[PDB]
């Protein structure tokens, strides 16, 4: 029974819907809760083959690490008629980049993620790491408060939110630095 099977585990929450159909649940219960091991990715039982292009069409093409940006190659790379291309062979010009071998002997020495407890899955990008108590900069600007966000003054009167019951927000039951006024 999926009911009583939940009494045999320190963290029975690990047991799930299809878990009761396992060939050896009396073990998998004890494995899945192993100390430092990580969960199985969730993209199965979703038939979508692990990705679609919905959220992936709004992403930037790429952005360089700051160590590579300060170098100055970015502006050097940027157009040509065909006969100019056969002229570019007959004419040819040398040294368009003309990089500083001192600079590219400098950056990656002189100048120059996630822990193990995380794993990526399909749709996850920003959300988990905007929460009750955590907001973005600009919307601070529209709000215009100098370094609580002021409707956590009314989270005093009307009470802690039904939606996020576990809530703590600064100064009330949560005894705050920078942006993040609640956890």
């Amino acid at each position: 029974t999926v009911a009583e099977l939940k009494q045999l585990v320190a963290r029975p929450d690990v047991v799930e819907m299809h878990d009761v159909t396992a060939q050896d649940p009396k073990l998998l219960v004890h494995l899945k809760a192993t100390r430092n091991s990580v969960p199985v990715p969730r993209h199965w039982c979703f038939k979508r083959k692990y990705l679609q292009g919905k959220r992936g069409i709004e992403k930037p093409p790429f952005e360089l690490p700051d160590f590579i940006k300060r170098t100055g190659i970015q502006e050097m790379r940027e157009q040509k008629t065909m006969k100019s291309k056969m002229r570019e062979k007959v004419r040819p010009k040398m040294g368009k980049i003309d990089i500083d071998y001192q600079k590219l002997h400098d950056a990656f020495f002189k100048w120059q993620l996630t822990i193990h407890g995380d794993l990526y899955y399909e749709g996850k990008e920003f959300e988990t790491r905007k929460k009750p108590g955590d907001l973005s900069d600009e919307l601070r600007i529209s709000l215009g408060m100098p370094v609580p966000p002021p409707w956590l003054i009314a989270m005093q009167r009307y009470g802690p939110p039904p939606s996020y019951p576990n809530l703590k927000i600064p100064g009330l039951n949560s005894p705050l630095y920078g942006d993040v006024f609640g956890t």
Partner: peptide, 11 residues
């Protein structure tokens, strides 16, 4: 430690 749980999974 990534390969444990996958061994006995029902599927």
């Amino acid at each position: 430690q990534y390969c444990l749980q996958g061994l006995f999974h029902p599927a």
